[PDB]
């Protein structure tokens, strides 16, 4: 830089700056950075003096050279030189770099021995939980005699958690539920991983909402087919697309979760499927023809018949919803007298009064028999609430 300033001509300096001042900036910057330890080791040192000289001189180079293609405010060097009050944030960041390089190399294993999943109470969990635990050990150990503020450690620790989980999800594009159960096991091993728990719940909600989008879109497409076509309901979307996707992308993974969370998300899933995907969607219909009622009855029939989860058979909510749905698929193609008399038997104990009235109105047209049926059901449900 001395030879730049005091050794070159104006045009010479100008050209040579134009050419290398970008490289000058980046290389000197990265050097100072990598060597931040020894330079900020002391408060006043001919190293820091000299490097501030170099920064001022490079700024004067940008100035005298009058270059625009590259700029060097030097403000960054000024700040890092003034970055004497932390002295640990740099060390903590180097520790972060070590730990992230460690976790990266962890995924860089060609033998994939970490992918070897071990059944622990019964959940198959890879070896990655242990390595992440060890890296957290090493990091909390690094913070032991670091004078870093306890407000930057939490941010950087959650950053580790987030980065690591993102790494794993990238490495768990298809076995995401295995990742979910491994991190649930980690949470059970360490509850202080709140970033981890929130993120894994968020990505689980993400995947379930994604398949929920898929299934509700596919259901709305099937209902579009039903409203458009009355002859061939085209069960193809149901039999070979919807039911297998549900079993082997939802039912089987959610069972693989194998816990209260697994059963609970199964139960929420079949809420969303029975009620939201179908019950709410069918109730949104304007009119249902006899052939359309038969098609919905068949659909509902092979759904309850194709979506039975014996794991949740003991769940009263599961039994109630599946019975409500099966009795839906029953009463869809039946006549009003059958509806009324099986309501007299009490089979509609799972159906809301208004939902039942809407069902009868959507199925049966404007007839005085329907009015008798609706008033009978209304006043039966009215005397059933005075006791």
């Amino acid at each position: 830089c001395d030879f730049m300033l005091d050794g070159l001509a104006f045009r010479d300096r100008k050209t040579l700056s134009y050419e290398l001042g970008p490289l000058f900036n980046t290389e000197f910057t990265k050097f100072v950075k990598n060597n931040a330890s020894i330079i900020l080791e002391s408060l006043d040192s001919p190293l820091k003096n000299l490097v501030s000289v170099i920064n001022n001189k490079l700024t004067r180079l940008v100035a005298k050279s009058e270059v625009t293609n590259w700029t060097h405010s030097g403000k960054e060097i000024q700040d890092l030189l003034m970055n004497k009050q932390l002295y640990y944030n740099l060390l903590l960041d180097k520790v972060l770099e070590s730990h992230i390089s460690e976790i990266r190399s962890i995924f860089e294993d060609p033998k994939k021995s970490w992918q070897n999943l071990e059944v622990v109470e019964h959940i198959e969990v890879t070896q990655l939980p242990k390595l992440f635990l060890a890296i957290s050990q090493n990091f909390k150990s690094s913070f032991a005699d670091s004078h870093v503020d306890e407000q930057y450690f939490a941010y950087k620790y959650n950053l580790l958690q987030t980065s690591y989980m993102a790494m794993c999800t990238a490495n768990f594009s298809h076995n995401w539920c295995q990742l979910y159960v491994d991190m649930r096991y980690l949470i059970e091993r360490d509850e202080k991983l709140y970033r981890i728990k929130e993120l894994t719940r968020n990505l689980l909600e993400t995947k379930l909402n994604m398949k929920y989008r898929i299934v509700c879109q596919l259901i709305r497409h099937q209902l579009t087919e039903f409203r458009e076509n009355e002859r061939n309901p085209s069960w193809d979307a149901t039999i070979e697309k919807l039911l297998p996707y549900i079993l082997k992308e939802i039912v089987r993974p959610l069972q693989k979760i194998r816990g209260e969370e697994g059963s609970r998300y199964l139960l929420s899933f079949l809420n969303f499927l029975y009620n939201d995907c179908v019950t709410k969607e069918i109730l949104k219909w304007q009119i249902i023809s006899e052939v359309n009622s038969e098609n919905l009855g068949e659909l509902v029939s092979l759904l309850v018949n194709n979506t039975d989860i014996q794991l949740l058979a003991k769940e009263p909510s599961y039994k109630k919803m599946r019975e409500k749905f099966a009795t839906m698929g029953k009463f869809l193609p039946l006549h009003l007298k059958e509806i009324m008399e099986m309501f007299y038997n009490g089979d509609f104990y799972l159906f809301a009064t208004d939902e039942l009235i809407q069902w009868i109105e959507l199925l049966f047209a404007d007839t005085p028999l329907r009015r008798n049926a609706i008033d009978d059901i209304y006043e039966i449900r009215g005397t059933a609430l005075d006791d």
């Binding site: 990266r104 980065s163 999800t169 990238a170 909600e205 993400t206 989008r213």
Partner: protein
Amino acid sequence: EVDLMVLHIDYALVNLDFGTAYELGKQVFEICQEAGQHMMKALGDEHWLTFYQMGKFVDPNWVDNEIPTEIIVLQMSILGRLLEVCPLEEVEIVTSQWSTLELELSARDLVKDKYA
């Protein structure tokens, strides 16, 4: 070849061809994944800035200037794969961007998606 292709991805971002861009990204990623570790490091130290730029692509023509959930998960997976081999000093920002997407991802109506 990867260099030409990432150039193409760059200029396609200049052209807003996120589709073709991501296709070439698939291509080059799989190319290097069966190329080798040295190639990972080389592409990383050479074009992580490119990958970051394009993992932070935003289309001005997006409905309500909102990123499509498909494009959300696309860039999400993109950043996820990138994070694995990108240089250390960047892990923060991408991750932030990741969370930047994730929070946004956790803030949409999925059944009736205005951006689908």
